[PDB]
Design a binder for this molecule. Structure first.
Ligand SMILES: *Cc1cc2c(cc1C)nc1c(=O)[nH]c(=O)nc-1n2C[C@H](O)[C@H](O)[C@H](O)COP(=O)(O)OP(=O)(O)OC[C@H]1O[C@@H](n2cnc3c(N)ncnc32)[C@H](O)[C@@H]1O
Ligand SMILES: *Cc1cc2c(cc1C)nc1c(=O)[nH]c(=O)nc-1n2C[C@H](O)[C@H](O)[C@H](O)COP(=O)(O)OP(=O)(O)OC[C@H]1O[C@@H](n2cnc3c(N)ncnc32)[C@H](O)[C@@H]1O
Ligand SMILES: CCCCCCCN
Ligand SMILES: CCCCCCCN
Ligand SMILES: [Mg+2]
Lengths: 448, 448
């Protein structure tokens, strides 16, 4: 019998396990995959790191910044220089030093006042209990899309906002409750924190990619504490402890931290069954839909033409791109995402068909040199059996107020972690770490 | 190796198994519970049958009516006589021959216009492909609640409509896409079909209850075909067949029919993993929330006072009640439901606490004789590990159009049944039977 069994070796589970270990308690981490890092995943291709999962940290994210520095991982800045390209429907691509300046002054004002109005709502949503917002009943019964329509903003402003919503939530404004969206914005500290490079969540990358930072965190655990390729199938509990069932046998512990995406937490064979409010909360916490890609070129040819590599296309299957070129300056990489419906359509197609769609959008925005592609590497996180969608869960209307209060509440000896349980930077690596710190503190207090 | 393995001995699984068997193919039915019937469940108490799950059949439910006839189960009518009682907030209870006649003629007109307008939308929704409705994109981007507000119907009319929505869907109008609600209404053949007793889904009951009809259907299988208390944990397939994993070992078949609620279908360990569109569809098909109760009296005392035993209290935790007394005329039974948010709140309390809430509402509406209770029997279907909510799944905005197309499509040698896959009377016993007939036909075509 160990003191704590942790299910999942994402940043949440590894953070929880290292905190239990450093407090001097015994811990076992059971991870389904043959690797740590979960929704962060780094592969070596073309002599550089390819982050197929989470890759960016920003200066409001104190826990991931501290962990990167603690474990000796260097950061590099997300390229900021060069013109952005904006494309609307059947129109001509517009170059501009910033995407802001491809709109009228009235449009930019309306966009910024829209963002300001969502932040006004967001500030009133308690980070620990969104269901206790004074207008929780109204806001949880409204989609974000209905709220956008009530502002009366023009089409091109609603369209620009929709690109940003899909890039942040991996879901459309019609899928999200306003209460969910507003909580998420509060959790990040504002709309510009979610959307911006400089000053925001996309400011910095890790030299060598993000999975190696998870490997360094796992290296703080003693030999034998981490079991890879060991999916948790069952979690039974009684008055004395918890019994974990794997294909390979049984693990006994005093307490458990389950640190997996909500959909996957509900699929475990719990004995006794989870209480109905928490089972149905997980039924109401669907993962997002994103396909992340890296288009590889021999060089970042767009830089020589004064382009940043960022395109913004509210009408295309790809909404937003970034220059993903490493500090060495080769190979050239354009990084981007299919989001929401576009992700589900693209996920049903082949890699070559997704490549063709991306290259076609880049050809019409960056230029026809985009068709001379060296390689194209992508990942549909919906098709990952141990994730079942990035970046994280969202809550549709009605879910936060009725089922939401069960989110973090322990069920006897089974405690909960995962970015979806964080108060600050929920949905990000930074919130995954927060959740592991919180769950570890709970379990250590409960052991006696 | 049997020709077909069926997962689940609900009406859908049992119907599929009997159709495969009658075509001369070998079949095994693996059922998790110690009984058949699934979301139908009958217990003997006070010398009568208590239907804890599905209980009613009505006109236009041709498949369940034919099955009842075939297997020798007689119907008895849902009592229709006596005054209904309507109560708003802290007002006086209103007696009326019908719920209709507790409202002004302007209110009734507005209600019937609202019902008519939803039926018009419904008739445009293809029963086999709701996502191919010409306005599918707009209808799936709206909640039913937003649509109700857009009609401009008065608030007290929207409030009465909301009671009906929660009674039918076991969910609020804010949880449902308009496209989902429209499809469901088309599937039933109209609003009146869903809400009415005489002429609608609540018209008739089965003598002896519904589980015995499932037991008679299961008795048409050869000895040894049905295995009870055998939860399916895994379902593997290759080019040659399927392998079912249970606690006890492995069952091989050529093809599988999975006939369980969507949430439970996603928790099976599929090898290969389900395609991402179907996995994420199940994440977007949460079960409703209902606690169904029967209050038992020595006699149906309300009949002698000219009361039907139906109360309608939009501002109380319980929805519509019904005279649940059997044809013998004793014991007296009041049947009713906690629905949606009220069901989630009620599920977290004890049976005795739910009893006290029900009895206080009945005392206020039927009178003080409602406190003279013999017994109180209820079931929280959210707490049932092999259902995880009644009556069935609903779909939030964005789900039908983006993920919905994966609903019925076989995945290699694995076919899908369950009421949630029915075209006609989806959500009812009648649709469960349809889905079983359809899945059997697909598997028989594939074997031959
Ligand atoms: C997928 C993704 C995520 C992402 C992103 C882009 C994509 C495509 N961009 C990000 C970014 O640039 N910066 C950032 O901060 N976040 C970004 N995100 C999100 C981020 O990756 C996640 O928020 C974070 O990684 C989540 O961490 P958490 O520890 O909460 O969850 P996890 O990584 O999913 O780990 C769970 C582990 O559990 C294992 N598992 C699942 N089921 C089981 C069972 N039954 N038994 C045992 N183990 C299980 C998983 O394999 C995983 O390792
Ligand atoms: C719960 C309920 C349902 C209901 C209703 C009232 C309540 C409280 N009132 C109804 C009514 O008056 N008239 C009517 O026509 N329907 C009513 N409903 C709905 C109705 O009961 C359902 O639509 C229908 O019974 C569903 O049948 P179906 O065959 O599709 O589904 P099921 O009954 O849930 O059966 C599934 C079986 O699968 C077993 N199970 C689940 N998981 C597993 C695994 N992993 N392995 C093996 N077996 C599994 C279940 O135990 C179940 O028996
Ligand atoms: C416009 C910014 C999009 C950010 C996508 C990554 C979220 N982790
Ligand atoms: C208004 C009717 C209430 C009963 C619904 C039962 C659904 N099968
Ligand atoms: Mg009547």
């Amino acid at each position: 019998q160990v003191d704590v069994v942790v299910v999942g070796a994402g940043f949440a589970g590894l953070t929880a396990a290292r905190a239990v270990h450093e407090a001097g308690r015994s811990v076992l981490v059971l991870e389904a995959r043959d690797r740590v890092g979960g929704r962060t995943c780094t592969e070596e291709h073309h002599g550089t790191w390819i982050d197929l999962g989470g890759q960016w940290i920003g200066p409001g994210q104190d826990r991931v910044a501290a962990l990167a520095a603690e474990l000796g991982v260097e950061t590099y800045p997300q390229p900021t220089e060069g013109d952005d390209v904006v494309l609307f429907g059947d129109g001509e691509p517009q170059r501009a030093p910033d995407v802001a300046l491809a709109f009228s002054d009235e449009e930019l004002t309306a966009y910024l006042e829209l963002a300001g109005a969502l932040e006004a709502i967001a500030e009133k949503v308690p980070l620990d209990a969104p269901w206790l917002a004074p207008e929780a009943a109204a806001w949880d019964a409204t989609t974000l899309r209905e709220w956008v329509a009530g502002t009366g903003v023009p089409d091109r402003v609603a369209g620009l906002f929709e690109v940003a919503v899909q890039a942040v939530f991996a879901a459309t404004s019609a899928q999200l409750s306003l209460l969910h969206a507003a909580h998420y914005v509060h959790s990040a500290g504002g709309w510009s924190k979610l959307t911006d490079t400089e000053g925001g969540a996309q400011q910095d990358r890790l030299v060598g990619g993000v999975q190696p930072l998870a490997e360094r965190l796992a290296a703080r655990l003693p030999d034998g504490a981490l079991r890879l390729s060991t999916p948790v199938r069952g979690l039974a509990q009684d008055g004395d402890g918890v019994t974990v069932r794997t294909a390979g046998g049984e693990v006994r512990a005093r307490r458990a931290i389950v640190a997996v995406p909500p959909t996957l937490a509900g699929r475990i064979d719990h004995d006794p069954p989870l209480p109905p409010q928490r089972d149905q909360l997980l039924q109401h916490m669907p993962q997002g839909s994103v396909v992340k890609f890296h288009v590889i070129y021999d060089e970042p040819w767009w830089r020589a033409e004064g382009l940043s590599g960022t395109v913004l296309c509210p009408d295309e299957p790809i909404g937003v791109t970034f220059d993903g070129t490493p500090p060495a300056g080769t190979p050239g990489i354009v990084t981007g995402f299919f989001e929401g419906p576009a992700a589900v359509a693209a996920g049903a197609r082949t890699r070559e068909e997704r490549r063709d769609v991306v290259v076609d959008v880049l050809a019409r925005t960056l230029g026809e040199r985009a068709r001379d592609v060296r390689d194209y590497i992508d990942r549909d996180w919906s098709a990952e059996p141990w994730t079942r969608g990035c970046y994280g869960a969202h809550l549709p209307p009605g879910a936060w107020t009725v089922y939401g209060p069960a989110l973090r509440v322990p069920v006897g000896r089974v405690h909960w972690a995962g970015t979806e349980t964080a108060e600050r930077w929920t949905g990000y690596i930074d919130g995954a770490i927060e959740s592991g710190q919180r769950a570890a503190a709970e379990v250590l207090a409960a052991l006696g």
